[PDB]
Amino acid sequence: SSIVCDNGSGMVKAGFSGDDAPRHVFPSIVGRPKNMQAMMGSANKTVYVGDEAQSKRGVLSLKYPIEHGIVTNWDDMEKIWHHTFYNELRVNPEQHNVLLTEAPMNPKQNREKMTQIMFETFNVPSLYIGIQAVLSLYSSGRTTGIVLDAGDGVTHTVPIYEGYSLPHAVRRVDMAGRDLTEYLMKIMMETGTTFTTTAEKEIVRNVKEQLCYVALDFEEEMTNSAKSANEEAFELPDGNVMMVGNQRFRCPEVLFKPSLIGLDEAPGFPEMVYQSINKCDIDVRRELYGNIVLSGGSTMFLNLPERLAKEISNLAPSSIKPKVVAPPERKYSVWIGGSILSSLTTFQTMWVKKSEYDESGPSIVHNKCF
Amino acid sequence: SSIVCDNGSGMVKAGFSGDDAPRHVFPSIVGRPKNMQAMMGSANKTVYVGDEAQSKRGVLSLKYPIEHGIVTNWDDMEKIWHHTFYNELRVNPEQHNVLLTEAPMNPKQNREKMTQIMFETFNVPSLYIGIQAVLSLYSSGRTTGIVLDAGDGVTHTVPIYEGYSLPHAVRRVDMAGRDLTEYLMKIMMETGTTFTTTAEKEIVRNVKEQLCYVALDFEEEMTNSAKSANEEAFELPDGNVMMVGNQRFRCPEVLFKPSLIGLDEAPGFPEMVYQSINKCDIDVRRELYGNIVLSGGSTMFLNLPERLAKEISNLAPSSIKPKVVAPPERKYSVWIGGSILSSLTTFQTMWVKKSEYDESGPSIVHNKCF
Amino acid sequence: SSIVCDNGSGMVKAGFSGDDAPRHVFPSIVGRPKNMQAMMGSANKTVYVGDEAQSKRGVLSLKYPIEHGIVTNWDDMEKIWHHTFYNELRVNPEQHNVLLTEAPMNPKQNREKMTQIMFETFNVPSLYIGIQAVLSLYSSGRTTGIVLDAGDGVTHTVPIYEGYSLPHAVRRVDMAGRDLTEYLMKIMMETGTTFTTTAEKEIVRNVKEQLCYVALDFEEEMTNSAKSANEEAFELPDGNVMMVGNQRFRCPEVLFKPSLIGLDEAPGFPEMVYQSINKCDIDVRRELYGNIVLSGGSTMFLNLPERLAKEISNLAPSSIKPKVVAPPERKYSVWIGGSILSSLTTFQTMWVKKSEYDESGPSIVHNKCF
Amino acid sequence: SSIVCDNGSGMVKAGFSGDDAPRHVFPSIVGRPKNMQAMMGSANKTVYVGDEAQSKRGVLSLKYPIEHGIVTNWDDMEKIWHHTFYNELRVNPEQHNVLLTEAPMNPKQNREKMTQIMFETFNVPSLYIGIQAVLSLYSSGRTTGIVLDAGDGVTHTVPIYEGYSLPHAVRRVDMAGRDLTEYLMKIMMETGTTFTTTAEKEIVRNVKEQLCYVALDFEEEMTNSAKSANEEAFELPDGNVMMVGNQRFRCPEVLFKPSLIGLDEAPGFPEMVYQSINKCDIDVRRELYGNIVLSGGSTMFLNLPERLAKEISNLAPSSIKPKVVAPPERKYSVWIGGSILSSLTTFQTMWVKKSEYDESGPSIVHNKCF
Amino acid sequence: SSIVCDNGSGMVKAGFSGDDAPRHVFPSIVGRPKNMQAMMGSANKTVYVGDEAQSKRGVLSLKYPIEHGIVTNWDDMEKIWHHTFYNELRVNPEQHNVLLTEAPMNPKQNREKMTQIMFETFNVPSLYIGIQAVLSLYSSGRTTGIVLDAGDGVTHTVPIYEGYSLPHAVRRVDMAGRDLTEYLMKIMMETGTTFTTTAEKEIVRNVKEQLCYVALDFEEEMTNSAKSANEEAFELPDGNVMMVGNQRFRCPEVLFKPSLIGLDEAPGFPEMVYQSINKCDIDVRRELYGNIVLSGGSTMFLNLPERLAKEISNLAPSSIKPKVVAPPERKYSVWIGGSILSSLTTFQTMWVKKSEYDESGPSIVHNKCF
Numbered sequence A, B, C, D, E: 001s002s003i004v005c006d007n008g009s010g011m012v013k014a015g016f017s018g019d020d021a022p023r024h025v026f027p028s029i030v031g032r033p034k035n036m037q038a039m040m041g042s043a044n045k046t047v048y049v050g051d052e053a054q055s056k057r058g059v060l061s062l063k064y065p066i067e068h069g070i071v072t073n074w075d076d077m078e079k080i081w082h083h084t085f086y087n088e089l090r091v092n093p094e095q096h097n098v099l100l101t102e103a104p105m106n107p108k109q110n111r112e113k114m115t116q117i118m119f120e121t122f123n124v125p126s127l128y129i130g131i132q133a134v135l136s137l138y139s140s141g142r143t144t145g146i147v148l149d150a151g152d153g154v155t156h157t158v159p160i161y162e163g164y165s166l167p168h169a170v171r172r173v174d175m176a177g178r179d180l181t182e183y184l185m186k187i188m189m190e191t192g193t194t195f196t197t198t199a200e201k202e203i204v205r206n207v208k209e210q211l212c213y214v215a216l217d218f219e220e221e222m223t224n225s226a227k228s229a230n231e232e233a234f235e236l237p238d239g240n241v242m243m244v245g246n247q248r249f250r251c252p253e254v255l256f257k258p259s260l261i262g263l264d265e266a267p268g269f270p271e272m273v274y275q276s277i278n279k280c281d282i283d284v285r286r287e288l289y290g291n292i293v294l295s296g297g298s299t300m301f302l303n304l305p306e307r308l309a310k311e312i313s314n315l316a317p318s319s320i321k322p323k324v325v326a327p328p329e330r331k332y333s334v335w336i337g338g339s340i341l342s343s344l345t346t347f348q349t350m351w352v353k354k355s356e357y358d359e360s361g362p363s364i365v366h367n368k369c370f
């Protein structure tokens, strides 16, 4: 059976082809102890991976090997893959095909080192690497539309018409949920709460995923909270209680005005879609407006699909009725689409075999995997 | 049953003998994709013909095999004929007679290659090729008059008296509707609209067929629009709106003064008829002035028959009253006349049989088909 | 004395008639601060123009008022002209004649608004507007030849024979150096360097003007760099070093195959000249092939004149020997030719006086300036 | 005359505008007796403020109202301000303007309560609050550079270019001289000396300011002292003598490696400057490296400017020559700059008047004081 | 077999590894006669050690070599060790390994002189020194929790999580049972009983260990005894009877408010635990609250565990349920844990051999014994 591994900046999702959902989802982190061992009977390790690092984070310093979709530490990246094959799936990687994913317009060296490790360290028989936004269209059962994908490190838009690519309209911003966590941690200091460690950053991420929401009218929302000053209580791991005010809707507002974090010229979600559509062709634009697909975990805020539709309607001409499609399970769209694609009988010739890599070299991955 | 196929520069019209109208009319284009396939489940082809190419033109580059009445790509010309027999009429071409049309004073190689393909590739039993302007007289039920035919690539005039040809008075200009589309696309840039692709050229052709008209007095019309500056709105496929000013009546004015597009010595519609009549005989001219017949799609502009009659009256002597006949269905005159001619019992000996071609060779078509 | 101002998409060149070179050349940009003032003693402005904006670009957002030869912001366009008259030339514009330039086939509204501002805001006595490619022929001292002009926004070709214009052979593409900067910035991401701001775009423009060159044989050049992988180092303003590989010759290759940036049907430099010549007359073509003149800053790449000559020779018939003339100072050909033309004694009747504008109105500029 | 009051965690500095130095500097402490009065003729108080508390500290328990730049006891904070106006300056606070200082990224409630006390309790006519690091640039007579300020509770870095703020590059650590005193008191127990009371903590602070110095090479310095074991004698208030060994250079080493006190992820002085510079813009970094300004009492250790310059040079690229500016009087830079700023004639409109506070409320301080 | 010797300020506990309890427990005192010998046949010594000194204390002056965990007389310290090896265990110290204990944050010279005596005077083969609070966790069979140890001279708290040390949260007060004996001896004078000699101080220590208890509500307990005035009788060695009133619960109240003996700023038992927990990490505090371990002889008062739990619950947040673990045999926890640790097979490499001391010197003990 073939293995589908959706590895992004934040999470790892692994499973087998043909299933409807991944069976193993864990954070993509590596932890190391920062103090000396005091007892003698402990079964402590020297490096912690995955959920082990998350649970013992009180005594560890945490690192993410991938930043903005690019691997910055290959030694720690092999530890995560070694964890996935032997501890999560519990298989022998020499007997399965592996399908991987990547963001568009990445440096070529990132794709070449990934292939070298898979063939030489793990001895995989055959390999394939896909583009994340294309795999999201497979899960929706359509061949026309524009996909907005926002995860932990990158946001990109890819338009497709009748199954044909439009390479000159692809956009990428490099600003996603991890930058939202840092902004929330900073504006939280206005109320007297300060977090600085990597372990405390994981607490801030939980506050974002439970209390933050998109305001339908931002300017009115600020005025109302200035007078009412309604607040909500959050319970910290140590038992204390933290109050959250207007930080709840100011944090996701970055996705609509990136100048709050210094990106004074980055477009933002409505303009990113609008500019990408107007670069395709005049005879294609009406169909693209009718199928706008949301994907990724950073699109899971409450009221985000409704706010996005209203903003685009103010940019498009009067006769255009934009339609935004937001599946309830869009956090796993990339993995689901990859499971569908690898099950097709016509795909069996698209695998990159080990024998071809032995002759052509690492550069063969660029010729194939289109 | 016999097949009538009126194939010009722009359109294909096909049907069966005895009918009052063709049953299949589609543009004569071939489309090819200009980008790479991105999905795997699509039923995409590699070449598109006819209305398929028109609908998917946003991702295709379009070509016309015929230019100025002469085939410039025989491989793409066979694709169009193959489309007509098997997808439109859905017949076996080995059991029907085929009647084709051609413009006068064409190169001899054009007619010879057409015969070779029909007999050897499609194995047609018998064949015939006619002159387009002569077939227009059949549909009017007359044997005397001069025909002005203007389609997409060629304009020609042919006079006939009592059923006798007058070979030394035939004229041909090679300037028709496709040159009108290019002129409209150029003078449209004076108002800030630029179209450059082949797909965008199809949009300009729709603007010509809906908003352009012939001005009865050109010089007065320009003066009035200089002050009023009245404009009309046209809605583009993507939802935007384009304003059209005096380009509405300047575009068809080319047919009356070809020096606007650089043909400083070509006559134009009134002079083309006038010069053709004065080359026939003094005892024939009065009858020719009384029956001037319009044919083709480029004669469908509003006010064109009225403007033409006035201009000729300024050239003819005072005792002559020219009369212009413009049937409301003159876009299909050539096809209708060919349907009538092929139904006559005296025509059954005029077919060129396959056996004769086997002996004489391709040159037999010149001896017959007179 | 008369003033010559060559204002294109990228640069402003100003001076006085009779001189051999302009005395003031600065970029055509306007800058505005994007953060709040923190100190109190600074002499900061609110808008920066010219070289002031270039030097302080670290804290400013930059805009070009002119895009593709058409003014898109008239308020910022007046600031640039106000800067030129009072800060660069330091004259009173009510005592001098002004000669301006424009690209062919521009919208009529662009020329009318330019005249209204000059007469009403600056109170210029007399005015004239010329065509850039014609002024380049004056600087070469010839009356026959075809001019290829490529600046920052537009590329056009204009043929002239014995001093007579050939209006139906003029071509224009709207693709020039600014599109080359954007393509270099995109293919630079394949090596792990990302620039997104307007200020960072000025750094990419300096890399193009120092390291990029035209490859004589493109296909062989790619193969050699695939094995040798020779690279060159460029020093960034902050002290870091960037390596440039085969991006050096891939960037100017767009001028020879515009399908790399999506213009799948635009001709390119050799085909643009070839198509323009074959539209003139059969008795003029041999003289045009003998005088092909290069003008503009986008023609300054190394090996460009040699590559252009070879490509044209493969399109022309065997008995034709094309000759390309590339002056070493062709970046200032338009300004130099305008200085010559305004010094002629026969030109003194060609000025458009203010009194005529008072009666006829802004439309007088179309009747004159031919 | 206007009053300038620089109130930090450790000291109070007060004076009048226009002077070159403050006239009153005293510690910011409040003392209360811990035993019962035994005699009857004493003029003892119940609360001691300032130098009175310092002298009688043998029978008092001492508290600091401000911790890490944030007021933790407002009742004791009013006693310190009441002491400053009536006992030190000896003025009526209803006739002078007051200028105050604050650290960046402080909680908003801290600034609001400060304004309420000044207007309602002391009836000040007009008020203003500034940022400490900005006022340090005024005293140096420059508008470009990055300021490192380290006092008793907070360390922060603020970059400024051409008088423009760069809000997204400000950093703050909350670790300063008071944490250095606690670390020295702990490692002093390795030699058999134990101090536990608040009064004994003032003795340890005097040892830090007289015997501690920065080692140019820390690892070599430890090795040399392991063999030589050279020591220095310090005389205690009671007449006994304490010997100090390698604690002299280990105490200020915390500023270069904060993991010695448990802040395993805080950067430290060289990394704090390096990270702040690399967040500004590529076109600004070279000027920032050339002007690095030291401010505050915790930068007064011997050899600190020389060690800082060497460490930064190992982080910057090879073509960069960092320059550190350390004025001999940098302990009073914030007060001096505030005296200069309040003397400017353009500043007279920046005062926040009492009438405005009556209408807008305490929130007016956020709109102004930028 | 290995020897375990738990030597604190008050008692000596010695035994062999593997046993469940020490076999020899005697006070750590040295006695000398204060009068002249009168008879001739007596077998009197000149120095008495251990239980010999306790029995003949009527004619001796007693001294403790160790005060606050630090040896103040090394000559008398060797007499106690010589007594333990030859009179109590009756072994040859050249054939056994010795494990010793020490309080945290002791002067380094104390540990170095101890090693020098063991290796050079007694010629021990191998040696090891541990931290007392860590050894108490071994006896409980846990790797997480915070230990409160209070003996005769020192009180300290040490938190441990998952076997990892937290060095920056260790606290030490230097106030234990010997200070409780002196306070009881002073407040006993309010009822007319005066003890001044060292021998009489041993009688007061017996009164503390039999009649003193912790009051659950101190303020109510004082009020009840003011009216009832209930008293208890104690029989002195000479036959007289002493009455004890409210001194029974006032003596152990010092452990909860150290200001009764002049330590006005020392925290006390509930605050010592509370401050130590809040210095560890937010993700560790909940587990520490659930395992609070009592150790040492000064925790043996009646009702002490119940009073401690109630006081901590008033300091912790509402969702926290503190749990105090008080083993019935906690007076020997340090010795028992050391017996367990020295029996582990993984510990056999942790011994400090004599050969290593010969080369490295006395400083080797700091590198090991972590």
Ligand SMILES: Nc1ncnc2c1ncn2[C@@H]1O[C@H](COP(=O)(O)OP(=O)(O)O)[C@@H](O)[C@H]1O
Residues within 6 Å of the ligand: A007, A008, A009, A010, A011, A012, A150, A151, A152, A153, A177, A178, A205, A208, A209, A210, A296, A297, A298, A299, A300, A301, A331
């Ligand atoms: N319900 C939610 N609301 C807002 N953000 C979320 C939610 N769930 C997950 N996220 C954010 O999505 C990011 C990761 O998204 P995902 O696409 O699943 O991972 P990856 O970036 O690895 O592809 C994380 O930064 C996380 O904070």
Ligand SMILES: Nc1ncnc2c1ncn2[C@@H]1O[C@H](COP(=O)(O)OP(=O)(O)O)[C@@H](O)[C@H]1O
Residues within 6 Å of the ligand: B007, B008, B009, B010, B011, B012, B150, B151, B152, B153, B177, B178, B205, B208, B209, B210, B296, B297, B298, B299, B300, B301, B331
């Ligand atoms: N209503 C109309 N008004 C003006 N032009 C028309 C109209 N309808 C068709 N045309 C033009 O007629 C041309 C084709 O005419 P037709 O004779 O039918 O085809 P063909 O040239 O193949 O014989 C096209 O260029 C089209 O733009």
Ligand SMILES: Nc1ncnc2c1ncn2[C@@H]1O[C@H](COP(=O)(O)OP(=O)(O)O)[C@@H](O)[C@H]1O
Residues within 6 Å of the ligand: C007, C008, C009, C010, C011, C012, C150, C151, C152, C153, C177, C178, C205, C208, C209, C210, C296, C297, C298, C299, C300, C301, C331
């Ligand atoms: N040496 C060079 N090599 C390549 N390109 C150049 C060179 N010098 C200038 N350019 C380009 O020429 C463009 C401007 O050319 P120019 O004709 O002088 O200005 P304008 O477009 O305003 O007329 C700019 O985009 C610049 O990048």
Ligand SMILES: Nc1ncnc2c1ncn2[C@@H]1O[C@H](COP(=O)(O)OP(=O)(O)O)[C@@H](O)[C@H]1O
Residues within 6 Å of the ligand: D007, D008, D009, D010, D011, D012, D150, D151, D152, D153, D177, D178, D205, D208, D209, D210, D296, D297, D298, D299, D300, D301, D331
């Ligand atoms: N010569 C010195 N060497 C080292 N530290 C010093 C020296 N002088 C003062 N300090 C320290 O500076 C701190 C206060 O600095 P300062 O900035 O003047 O006060 P504040 O923190 O109130 O602004 C005190 O902790 C003091 O110990």
Ligand SMILES: Nc1ncnc2c1ncn2[C@@H]1O[C@H](COP(=O)(O)OP(=O)(O)O)[C@@H](O)[C@H]1O
Residues within 6 Å of the ligand: E007, E008, E009, E010, E011, E012, E150, E151, E152, E153, E177, E178, E205, E208, E209, E210, E296, E297, E298, E299, E300, E301, E331
């Ligand atoms: N039952 C008891 N109640 C109160 N205090 C006790 C009790 N038993 C012993 N102590 C006190 O404990 C102290 C010694 O405790 P321990 O920890 O055994 O010795 P060390 O201090 O040498 O480690 C002595 O001061 C003694 O008075």
Ligand SMILES: [Mg+2]
Residues within 6 Å of the ligand: A008, A132, A151, A296, A297, A334
């Ligand atoms: Mg993802």
Ligand SMILES: [Mg+2]
Residues within 6 Å of the ligand: B008, B132, B151, B296, B297, B334
């Ligand atoms: Mg026709």
Ligand SMILES: [Mg+2]
Residues within 6 Å of the ligand: C008, C132, C151, C296, C297, C334
């Ligand atoms: Mg130019």
Ligand SMILES: [Mg+2]
Residues within 6 Å of the ligand: D008, D132, D151, D296, D297, D334
């Ligand atoms: Mg300060």
Ligand SMILES: [Mg+2]
Residues within 6 Å of the ligand: E008, E132, E151, E296, E297, E334
């Ligand atoms: Mg003990």
